[PDB]
PDB file of C-alpha atoms and ligand atoms in Angstrom:
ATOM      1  CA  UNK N1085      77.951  92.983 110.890  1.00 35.94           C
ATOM      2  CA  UNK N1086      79.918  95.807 108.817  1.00 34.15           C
ATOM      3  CA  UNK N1087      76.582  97.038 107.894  1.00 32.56           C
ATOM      4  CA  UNK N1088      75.781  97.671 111.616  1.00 34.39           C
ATOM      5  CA  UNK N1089      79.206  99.252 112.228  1.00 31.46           C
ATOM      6  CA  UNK N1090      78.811 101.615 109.055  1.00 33.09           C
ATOM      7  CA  UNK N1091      75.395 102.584 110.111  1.00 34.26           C
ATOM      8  CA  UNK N1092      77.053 103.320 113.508  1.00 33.36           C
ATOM      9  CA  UNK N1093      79.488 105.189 111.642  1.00 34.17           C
ATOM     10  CA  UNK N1094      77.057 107.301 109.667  1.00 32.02           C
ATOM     11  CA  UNK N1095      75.062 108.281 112.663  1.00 32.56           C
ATOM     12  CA  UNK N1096      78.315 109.243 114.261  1.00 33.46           C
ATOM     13  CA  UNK N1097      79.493 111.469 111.214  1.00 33.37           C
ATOM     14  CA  UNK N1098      75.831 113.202 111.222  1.00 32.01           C
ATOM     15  CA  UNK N1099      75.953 114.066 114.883  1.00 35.03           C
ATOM     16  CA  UNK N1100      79.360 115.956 114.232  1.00 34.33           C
ATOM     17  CA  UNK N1101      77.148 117.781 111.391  1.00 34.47           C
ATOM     18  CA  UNK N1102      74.766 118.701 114.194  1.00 34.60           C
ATOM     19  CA  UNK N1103      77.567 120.021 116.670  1.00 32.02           C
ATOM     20  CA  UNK N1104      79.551 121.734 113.685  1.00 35.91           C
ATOM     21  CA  UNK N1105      76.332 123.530 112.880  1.00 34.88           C
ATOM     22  CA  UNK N1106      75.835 124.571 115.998  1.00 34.35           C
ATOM     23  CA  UNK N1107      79.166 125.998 116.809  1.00 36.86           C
ATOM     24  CA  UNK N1108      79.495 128.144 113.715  1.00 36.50           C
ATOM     25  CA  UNK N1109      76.360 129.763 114.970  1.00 35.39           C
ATOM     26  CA  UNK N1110      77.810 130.101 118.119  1.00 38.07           C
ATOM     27  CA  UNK N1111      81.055 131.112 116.168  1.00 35.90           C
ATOM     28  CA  UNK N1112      79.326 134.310 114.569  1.00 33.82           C
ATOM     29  CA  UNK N1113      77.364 134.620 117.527  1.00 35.57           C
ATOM     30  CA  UNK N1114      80.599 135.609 119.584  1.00 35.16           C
ATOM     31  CA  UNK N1115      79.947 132.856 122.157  1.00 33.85           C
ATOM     32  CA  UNK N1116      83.575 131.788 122.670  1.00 32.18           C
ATOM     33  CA  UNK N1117      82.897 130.019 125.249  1.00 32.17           C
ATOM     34  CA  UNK N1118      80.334 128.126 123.679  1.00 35.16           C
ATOM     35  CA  UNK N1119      82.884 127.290 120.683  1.00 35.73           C
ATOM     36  CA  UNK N1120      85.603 126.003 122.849  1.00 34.98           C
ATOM     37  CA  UNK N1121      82.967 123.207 124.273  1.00 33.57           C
ATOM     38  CA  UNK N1122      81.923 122.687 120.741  1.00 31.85           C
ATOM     39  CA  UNK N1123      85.586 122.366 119.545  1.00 30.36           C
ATOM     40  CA  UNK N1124      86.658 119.548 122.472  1.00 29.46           C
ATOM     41  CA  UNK N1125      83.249 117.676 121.459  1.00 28.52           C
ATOM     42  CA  UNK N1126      84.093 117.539 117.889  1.00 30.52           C
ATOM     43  CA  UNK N1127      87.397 116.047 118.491  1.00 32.31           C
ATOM     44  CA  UNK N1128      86.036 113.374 120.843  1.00 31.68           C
ATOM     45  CA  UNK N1129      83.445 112.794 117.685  1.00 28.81           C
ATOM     46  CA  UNK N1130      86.215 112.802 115.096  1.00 27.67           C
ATOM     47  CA  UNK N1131      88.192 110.363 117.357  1.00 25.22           C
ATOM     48  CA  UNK N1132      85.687 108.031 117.492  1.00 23.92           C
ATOM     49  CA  UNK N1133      84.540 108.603 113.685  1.00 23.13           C
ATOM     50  CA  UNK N1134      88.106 106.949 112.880  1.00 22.83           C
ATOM     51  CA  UNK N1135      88.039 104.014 115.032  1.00 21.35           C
ATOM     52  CA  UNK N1136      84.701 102.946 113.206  1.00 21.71           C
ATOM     53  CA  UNK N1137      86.307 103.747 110.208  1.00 24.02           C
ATOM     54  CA  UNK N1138      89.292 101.626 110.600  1.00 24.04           C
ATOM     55  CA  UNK N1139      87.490  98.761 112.264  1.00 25.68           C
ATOM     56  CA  UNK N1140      85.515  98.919 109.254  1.00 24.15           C
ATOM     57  CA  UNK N1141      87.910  98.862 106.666  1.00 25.50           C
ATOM     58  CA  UNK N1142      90.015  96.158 108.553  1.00 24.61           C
ATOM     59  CA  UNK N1143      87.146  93.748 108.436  1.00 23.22           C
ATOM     60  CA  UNK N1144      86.769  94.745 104.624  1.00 26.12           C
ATOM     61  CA  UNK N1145      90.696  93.380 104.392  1.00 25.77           C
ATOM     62  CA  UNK N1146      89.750  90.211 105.969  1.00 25.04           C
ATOM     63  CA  UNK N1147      87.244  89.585 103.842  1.00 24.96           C
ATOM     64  CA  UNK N1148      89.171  90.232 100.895  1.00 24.97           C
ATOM     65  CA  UNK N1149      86.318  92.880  99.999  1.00 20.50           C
ATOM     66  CA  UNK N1150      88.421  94.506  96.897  1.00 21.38           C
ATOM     67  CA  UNK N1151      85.839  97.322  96.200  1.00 24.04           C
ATOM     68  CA  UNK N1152      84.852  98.551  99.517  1.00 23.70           C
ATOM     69  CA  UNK N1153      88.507  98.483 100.771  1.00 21.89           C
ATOM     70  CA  UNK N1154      89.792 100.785  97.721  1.00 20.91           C
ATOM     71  CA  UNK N1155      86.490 102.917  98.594  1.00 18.01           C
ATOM     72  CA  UNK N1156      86.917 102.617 102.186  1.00 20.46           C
ATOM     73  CA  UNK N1157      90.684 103.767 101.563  1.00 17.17           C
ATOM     74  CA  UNK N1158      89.181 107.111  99.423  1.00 16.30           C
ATOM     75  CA  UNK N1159      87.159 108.238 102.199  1.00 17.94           C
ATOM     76  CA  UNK N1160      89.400 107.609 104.826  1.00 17.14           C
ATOM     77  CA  UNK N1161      92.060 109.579 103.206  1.00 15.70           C
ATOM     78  CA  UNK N1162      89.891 112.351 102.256  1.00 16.96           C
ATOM     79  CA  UNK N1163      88.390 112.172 106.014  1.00 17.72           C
ATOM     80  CA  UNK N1164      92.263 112.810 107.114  1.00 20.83           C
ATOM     81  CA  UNK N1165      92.526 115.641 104.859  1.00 24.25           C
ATOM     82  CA  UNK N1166      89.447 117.130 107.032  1.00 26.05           C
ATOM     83  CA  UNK N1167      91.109 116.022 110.471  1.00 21.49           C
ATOM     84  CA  UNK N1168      93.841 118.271 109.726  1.00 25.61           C
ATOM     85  CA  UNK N1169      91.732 121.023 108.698  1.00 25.06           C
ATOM     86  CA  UNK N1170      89.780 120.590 111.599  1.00 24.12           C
ATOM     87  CA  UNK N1171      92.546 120.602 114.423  1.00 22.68           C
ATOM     88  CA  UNK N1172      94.370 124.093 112.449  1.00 24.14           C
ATOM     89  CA  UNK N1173      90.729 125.440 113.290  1.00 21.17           C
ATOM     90  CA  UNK N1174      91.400 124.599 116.911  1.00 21.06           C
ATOM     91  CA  UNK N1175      94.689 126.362 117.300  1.00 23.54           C
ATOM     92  CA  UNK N1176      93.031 129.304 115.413  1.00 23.76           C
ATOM     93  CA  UNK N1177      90.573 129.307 117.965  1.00 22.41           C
ATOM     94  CA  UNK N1178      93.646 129.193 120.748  1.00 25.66           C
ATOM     95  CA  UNK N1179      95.409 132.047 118.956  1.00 29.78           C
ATOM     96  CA  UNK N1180      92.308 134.135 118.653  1.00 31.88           C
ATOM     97  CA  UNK N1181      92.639 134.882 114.772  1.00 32.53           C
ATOM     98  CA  UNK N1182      89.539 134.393 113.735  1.00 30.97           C
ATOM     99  CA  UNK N1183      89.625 135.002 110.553  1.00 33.12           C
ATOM    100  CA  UNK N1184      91.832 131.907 109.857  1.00 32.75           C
ATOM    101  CA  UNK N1185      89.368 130.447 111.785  1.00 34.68           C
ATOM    102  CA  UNK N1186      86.046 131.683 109.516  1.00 32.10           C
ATOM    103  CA  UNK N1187      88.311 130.546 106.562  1.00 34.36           C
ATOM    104  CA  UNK N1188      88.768 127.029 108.176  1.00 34.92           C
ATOM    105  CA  UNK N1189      85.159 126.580 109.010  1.00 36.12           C
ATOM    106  CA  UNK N1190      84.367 127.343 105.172  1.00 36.37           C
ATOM    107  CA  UNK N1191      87.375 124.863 104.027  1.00 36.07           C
ATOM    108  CA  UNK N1192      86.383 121.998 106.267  1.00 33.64           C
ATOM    109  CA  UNK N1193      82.196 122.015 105.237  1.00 34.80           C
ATOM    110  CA  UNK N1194      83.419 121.281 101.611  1.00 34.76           C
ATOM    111  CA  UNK N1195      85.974 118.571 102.174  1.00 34.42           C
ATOM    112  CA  UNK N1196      83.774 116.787 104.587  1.00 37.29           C
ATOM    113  CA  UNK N1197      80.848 117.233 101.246  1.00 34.05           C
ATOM    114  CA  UNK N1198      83.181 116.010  99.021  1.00 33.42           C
ATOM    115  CA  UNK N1199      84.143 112.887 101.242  1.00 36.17           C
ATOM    116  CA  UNK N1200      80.335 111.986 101.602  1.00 38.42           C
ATOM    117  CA  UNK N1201      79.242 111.763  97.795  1.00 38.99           C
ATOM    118  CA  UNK N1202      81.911 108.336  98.525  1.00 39.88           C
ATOM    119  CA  UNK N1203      79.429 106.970 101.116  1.00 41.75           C
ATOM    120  CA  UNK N1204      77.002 105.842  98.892  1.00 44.11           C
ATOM    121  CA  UNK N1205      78.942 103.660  97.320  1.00 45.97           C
ATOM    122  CA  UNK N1206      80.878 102.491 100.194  1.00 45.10           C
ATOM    123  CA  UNK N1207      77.328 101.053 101.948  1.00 42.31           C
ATOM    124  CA  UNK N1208      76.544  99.149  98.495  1.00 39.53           C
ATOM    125  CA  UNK N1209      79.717  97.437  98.236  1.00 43.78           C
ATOM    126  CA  UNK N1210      80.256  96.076 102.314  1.00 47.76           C
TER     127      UNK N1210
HETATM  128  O1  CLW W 543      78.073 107.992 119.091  1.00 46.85           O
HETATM  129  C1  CLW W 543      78.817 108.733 119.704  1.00 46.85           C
HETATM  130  N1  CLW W 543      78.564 110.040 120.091  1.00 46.85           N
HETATM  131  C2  CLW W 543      79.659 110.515 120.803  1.00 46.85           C
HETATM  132  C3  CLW W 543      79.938 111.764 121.396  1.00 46.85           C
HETATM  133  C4  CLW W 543      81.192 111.867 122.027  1.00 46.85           C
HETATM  134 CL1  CLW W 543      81.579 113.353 122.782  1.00 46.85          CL
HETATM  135  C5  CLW W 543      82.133 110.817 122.107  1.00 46.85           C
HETATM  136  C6  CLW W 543      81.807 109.589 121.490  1.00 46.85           C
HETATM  137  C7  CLW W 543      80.565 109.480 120.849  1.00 46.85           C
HETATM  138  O2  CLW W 543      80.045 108.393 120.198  1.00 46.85           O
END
């Protein structure tokens, strides 16, 4: 059901905590290398992050689901807000300024906090 797509969803949002995690160490470790694998996974996770998200809140339209489609339409806008901040990390990471890139890093860990205290909410209401 939605529930089983929004637990898929979760578990895919908490394994892009994992690989963030691990390529900031990396980041400060000076394993560029590292990073740049780290960087292509976490667009492939974000990617897919978005299609649950959207097949989600399409089945909350066709159920007429008022609450979880106005919460559902939060998060996904404060998600996008995160997407963005995640791909100007990448082409920090292409341009080699790093410190744009630290800054990013920093940026994008408190948007994607402040998109989660939504999700809560969100699995009450589907
Ligand atoms: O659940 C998942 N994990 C994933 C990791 C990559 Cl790289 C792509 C899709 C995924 O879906």
């Amino acid at each position: 059901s939605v529930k089983s797509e929004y637990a898929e969803a979760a578990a895919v949002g908490q394994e892009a905590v994992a690989v963030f995690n691990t390529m900031k160490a990396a980041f400060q470790n000076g394993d560029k290398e590292a990073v740049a694998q780290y960087l292509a996974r976490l667009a492939s996770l974000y990617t897919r992050h978005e299609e649950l998200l959207n097949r989600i809140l399409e089945k909350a339209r066709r159920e007429g689901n008022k609450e979880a489609v106005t919460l559902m339409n939060e998060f996904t806008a404060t998600f996008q807000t995160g997407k963005s901040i995640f791909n100007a990390m990448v082409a920090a990471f292409k341009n080699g300024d790093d410190d744009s890139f630290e800054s990013y890093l920093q940026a994008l860990e408190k948007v994607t906090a402040k998109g989660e205290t939504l999700a809560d909410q969100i699995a009450k209401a589907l």
